[PDB]
Amino acid sequence: GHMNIEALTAELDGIRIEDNEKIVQQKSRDFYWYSPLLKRQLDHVTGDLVVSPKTEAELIRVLKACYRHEVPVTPRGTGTGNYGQAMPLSGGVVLSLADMNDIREIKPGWVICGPGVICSDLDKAARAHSGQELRMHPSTYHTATVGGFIAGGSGGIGSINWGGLRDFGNIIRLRVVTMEQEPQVLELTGEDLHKVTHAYGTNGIITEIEMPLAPAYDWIDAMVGFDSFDTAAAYANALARQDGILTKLVSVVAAPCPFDYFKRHQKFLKEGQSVVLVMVAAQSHDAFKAFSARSGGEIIFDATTAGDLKGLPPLFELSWNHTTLRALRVDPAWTYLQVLYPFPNQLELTAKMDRMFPGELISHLEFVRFDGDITCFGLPLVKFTTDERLEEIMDLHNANGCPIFNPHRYTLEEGGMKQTDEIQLAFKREADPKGLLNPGKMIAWDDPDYDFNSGKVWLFKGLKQA
């Protein structure tokens, strides 16, 4: 309970605020509980107030009042993150951007919108306007905001074509408001916007996004079935390398996950079958069938031949961390890892990890472009037993050439994605000199003795060059 809440509230007349304990608690939590460790470590976290600005002017009024009363501010889109990113470690204000949902420009190849736009609503507008859609979106498409995807996410559906938010070009411009005595507006383009990507809101509030757009095609859901995980992974790798077959998703989900946890599609599945989830553009569908017939890929579900699709979720809601959701809804002991299998050894590495952890781990791959190669990331399911065994499983992945981005952590550095360097530290001081933006999420800000120059493989490498 921050000491200055009464005075801060008195300065916010006319701005929508909420101090009801139950609502504040709900809006102080994301999906951190996918991690048993975070579920325990973050159980006591709650804010003091939820503040919901409608416009950038209201946001500036809120930040100015929080700065002068030194009340921490933790941004929130819609709170669908998995690492506790939007959770206020120091209490204070949960700053919801959900009402800043303008969509102000759609052009051939790009869109300009506010941070609170839900991904699926952005696509609804871009499709109606000119048959366009986002290049990539999280499997939380229907619930997650664009601003929270940029500040807290990394990629997802469409990464097979475009890579991820780590890559130049997948975001065009970020307009950011600083936490200063007089909040400043920064228009970040070029490499500068990459200081903000996956920074958990610690270096400014995104108030406008310019992102590229891609063509909205008739994407056809298909599942390809296999009697082993290795054969499924080999097929998915080969399909992902078909440069003329346009896909939006290529996932591998190892048995027993599909038959056990993909309940609505169960009529298309059988016990022991691993599956490859595919979204294929209608103009590439015939070639996909011809390639699959040549490549030993049995199509066990095709949205164009399956008949009545009523009640079936889109295959993307069986992919990415939706795969984890489907498993933990049936058995809550399942958690997950985040893994890279570096090119060109991804088939051998995924198989080795699969064999190393029988029963305890269920393999799950997502094929993506990564540094110009086609490879796969992993979201393997892990049956939680003890904290120590979970750390050991992750240590073993790292020691066997499969870098881990630890999702059982709530800080930037320990999560393995957003590298801290001198430029990141200088920018946080520029955008948040008092350290009021999402405190506790950046270890190097709190600890001048912390060695931020360790950590091997970073998904979002820092800007500083050699």
Ligand X SMILES: Cc1cc2nc3c(=O)[nH]c(=O)nc-3n(C[C@H](O)[C@H](O)[C@H](O)COP(=O)(O)OP(=O)(O)OC[C@H]3O[C@@H](n4cnc5c(N)ncnc54)[C@H](O)[C@@H]3O)c2cc1C
**Sites of contact with a second copy (CB under 8 A):** 108-110, 130-132, 135, 161-163, 167-170, 172-173, 189-191, 212-218, 240-246, 281-284, 286-291, 293-294, 369-374, 465
Question: What is the closest distance, in whole angstroms, from the C-beta atom of residue 42 to a second copy in the complex?
Answer: 33
Residue 140, annotated as binding a ligand = yes
DSSP 8-state class, residue 436: -
3-state DSSP: the chain helix, strand, coil percent, rounded to 5?
30, 25, 45
Comparing CB distances to a second copy, the nearer of 187 and 451 is 187
- Using CB under 6 A, which of 47, 53, 72, 148 touches ligand X? 148
The dihedral sign for the CA sequence 434, 440, 442, 444: positive
Closest of 465, 464, 414, 417 to residue 444, by C-alpha: 414
Binding-site size for ligand X (CB under 6 A) equals 38
Comparing CB distances to ligand X, the nearer of 81 and 225 is 81
Comparing CB distances to a second copy, the nearer of 112 and 396 is 112
Comparing CB distances to ligand X, the nearer of 139 and 419 is 139
Comparing CB distances to ligand X, the nearer of 149 and 460 is 149
Question: What is the closest distance, in whole angstroms, from the C-beta atom of residue 70 to a second copy in the complex?
Answer: 36
Q: Is 144 in the site for ligand X (CB under 6 A)?
A: yes
Checking the chain for breaks where C and the next N are over 2.5 Å apart, the residues before them are none
- Return all residues near 258 (Cβ < 8 A) that are at least 6 apart: 265, 269, 273, 274, 275
Question: What is the closest distance, in whole angstroms, from the C-beta atom of residue 399 to ligand X in the complex?
Answer: 26
Comparing CB distances to ligand X, the nearer of 323 and 350 is 323
Residue 154 interacting partner from ligand X, a second copy, none (CB closer than 5 to 8 Å by kind): ligand X
Q: Is 166 in the site for ligand X (CB under 6 A)?
A: no
Question: What is the closest distance, in whole angstroms, from the C-beta atom of residue 321 to a second copy in the complex?
Answer: 22
Distance CA(435)–CA(72), nearest Å, equals 8
Comparing CB distances to a second copy, the nearer of 217 and 259 is 217
Question: What is the closest distance, in whole angstroms, from the C-beta atom of residue 133 to ligand X in the complex?
Answer: 15
428: three-class secondary structure by DSSP: helix
Q: Is 170 in the site for ligand X (CB under 6 A)?
A: no
Question: What is the closest distance, in whole angstroms, from the C-beta atom of residue 255 to ligand X in the complex?
Answer: 21
Distance CA(199)–CA(431), nearest Å, equals 12
Neighbours of 279 (CB within 10 A): 23
The HSE-up count of residue 126 (CA atoms within 13 Å, CB side) is 27
Tokens of 213: 């757009």
Can you spell out the DSSP letters for 328-369?
HHH-TTEEE--EEE-TT-HHHHHHHHHHHSTTTEE-EEEEEE
Neighbours of 185 (CB within 10 A): 13
Comparing CB distances to ligand X, the nearer of 80 and 346 is 80
- Using CB under 6 A, which of 132, 139, 346, 406 touches ligand X? 139
Comparing CB distances to ligand X, the nearer of 95 and 353 is 95
Of 48-56, 184-192, 198-206, 336-344, which segment contacts ligand X by CB under 6 A?
198-206
DSSP 8-state class, residue 312: P
Strand partners, 280: 220, 247
Of 201-209, 232-240, 339-347, 419-427, which segment contacts ligand X by CB under 6 A?
201-209
- Using CB under 6 A, which of 35, 46, 80, 420 touches ligand X? 80
Residue 75, annotated as binding a ligand = yes
- Using CB under 6 A, which of 35, 237, 292, 438 touches ligand X? 438
Question: What is the closest distance, in whole angstroms, from the C-beta atom of residue 455 to ligand X in the complex?
Answer: 19
Question: What is the closest distance, in whole angstroms, from the C-beta atom of residue 388 to a second copy in the complex?
Answer: 38
378: three-class secondary structure by DSSP: strand
Closest of 300, 113, 103, 301 to residue 206, by C-alpha: 113
Contact assessment for residue 255 and residue 229, using Cβ atoms and an 8 Å cutoff: yes
Question: What is the closest distance, in whole angstroms, from the C-beta atom of residue 188 to a second copy in the complex?
Answer: 11
Residue 78, annotated as binding a ligand = yes
- The torsion angles phi and psi of 439, rounded to 5 degrees, stand at -60, 155
Binders of ligand X among 289-328, rule CB under 6 A? 320-322, 325
Distance CA(381)–CA(390), nearest Å, equals 11
Which residue numbers belong to the known binding site?
Answer: 75, 77-81, 85, 139-140, 145, 154-155, 206
* Residues making up the binding site for FAD: 75, 77-81, 85, 139-140, 145, 154-155, 206
